[PDB]
Paper text:
Nevertheless, electron densities for residues 91–100 were relatively weak and poorly defined. NAD binds to TtMDH in the same extended conformation seen for other members of this enzyme family. Residue 42 of TtMDH is a glutamate, which hydrogen-bonds to the adenine ribose instead of the otherwise conserved aspartate in other MDHs.
[name] from [name] (TtMDH) is more similar in amino acid sequence to NADP-dependent chloroplastic [name] than NAD-dependent bacterial and mitochondrial MDHs. The molecular mass of TtMDH in solution determined by analytical gel filtration chromatography was about 61 kDa, so TtMDH is a homodimeric enzyme like most MDHs.
Numbering used by the authors:
A (entry chain D): 1 to 92, 101 to 326
B (entry chain A): 1 to 91, 101 to 326
Write the structure that this text describes.
Amino acid sequence: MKAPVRVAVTGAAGQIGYSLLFRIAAGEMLGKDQPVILQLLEIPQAMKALEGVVMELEDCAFPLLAGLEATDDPKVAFKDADYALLVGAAPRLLQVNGKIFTEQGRALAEVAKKDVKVLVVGNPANTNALIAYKNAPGLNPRNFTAMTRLDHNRAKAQLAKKTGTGVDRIRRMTVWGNHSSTMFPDLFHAEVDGRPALELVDMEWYEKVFIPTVAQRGAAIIQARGASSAASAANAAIEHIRDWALGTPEGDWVSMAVPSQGEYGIPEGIVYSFPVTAKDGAYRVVEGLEINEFARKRMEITAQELLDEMEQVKALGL
Amino acid sequence: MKAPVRVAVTGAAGQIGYSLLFRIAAGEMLGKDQPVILQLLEIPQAMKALEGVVMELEDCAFPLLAGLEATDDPKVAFKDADYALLVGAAPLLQVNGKIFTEQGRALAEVAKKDVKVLVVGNPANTNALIAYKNAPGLNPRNFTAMTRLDHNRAKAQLAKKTGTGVDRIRRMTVWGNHSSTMFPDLFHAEVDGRPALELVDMEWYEKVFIPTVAQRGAAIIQARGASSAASAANAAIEHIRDWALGTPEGDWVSMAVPSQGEYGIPEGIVYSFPVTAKDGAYRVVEGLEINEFARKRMEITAQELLDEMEQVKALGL
């Protein structure tokens, strides 16, 4: 019934975009009652391939796809966007990523809706989201986020498997920090069918199996498939946006990397994964948690990495 | 939260699978209240890649994915299957003969008696034929092939031309099979409750629409450097979904199903008809007036499928 919303998506002809766009047009991201207009962006070199993706989207005959355009100019892609998924990044320099997210930052602040919701997916996501909101004058910095939902989902999957519990009964999972080898999956607050996770697993498995498995999971899939985890990444992005926009379940929370306002003693400014609830299009960092020494030490090590990256970005005036 | 159903999918680590499995596991195919168990089949050389796909599905934390296994053994993949999506085919007629003879047999041996079978791998109509012929004990009526992609392509082209939403287009039909000689039918199709030819003309229908639909797959390969995996997967999902959950009232879809001899289509071949579906059963729309322009074009694929059916018999498949 609702009026259409505009969804901008970059890197739209790449593997993540190919897994992402069809499910967005199907209504899996914002609901069955919410028509979407897709505004897709690519580099000029990939525009030919992007037109092929457009033909396929058309070929699904999606009833919620209320509009569809493809461009290589950010000021057209971001034009009156309500949502902006920044999937495309440097092909793998902090130089290149810097120029992308500065350009895309100012473009968003130029032509997007004032309360546009921004999700950075391309790595390094946390620092790219930093560069982006930093160069987005007039836009609330808190509308800029980066994705740790995949680590979140990966962590949850390993816990369900270990405890013989369905994933739908795993709640209050948390991944702190950035999307990197220093990320911290937190089982001290996680619940398995209403029991504390560490009632059902002990510390040695946590430290020696669970944390390394989640942290190394991307490399394993690359090993098996000969390609990165596009589909589970895209599903993660979809859920990141969906929970942000439609709300988190009562009693639960998710991981979102957001500009730190100092909570849990995390340095201000940097984009950092927190436990969050979301309601009516707005997230709130979950307060009132107790942080022990093991958690604290690992949360600080991610923070330091992010602080290192921030001071390096500032070293280039970005 | 109904009891889970088992869904078998072959060629699971291929491009179409990679687009398929995640939407299925999410509940897009059978509904949000229907848990599924995915039983994934690949060839031995692809099992390593398939394990990667398994990891990825797990990493989505899908609440409706009640189970998940990977195997290179059809008798394992198809065990107690309620649905079977036969996506993997030859990467010729000999090779497909072996594949779909074996998979028809596996299905007979171990799948549910009322297992709904969808053949996606090309040439789908004949592969479905070989599979139902080698499936003693299963109903031939449950063996189907996909023409939903062409159907959907055709809708997309009619919508673009008339400037209306795709949701105002109903009763599209693509007769025959997934091939260049397929027949998209505008004589029965409707735009906003009006006959399509009151909104577009015969010349455009003839010289633009029909070849545009037939050449579409090639146009996508030319653009992406790869085939239509995602829209193919989407067509497969809707094929099953409409079959399972029913078609909208006043509407119908295309499905290639065993012909019983109607509409001048030789009996026994699998052939795309306009069909409705209600309660997991499909029914060919009957009593449509067919004109000679259409009949002639339908018979091209009807006769080329009949030839394939005879050619398959001569090879004892």
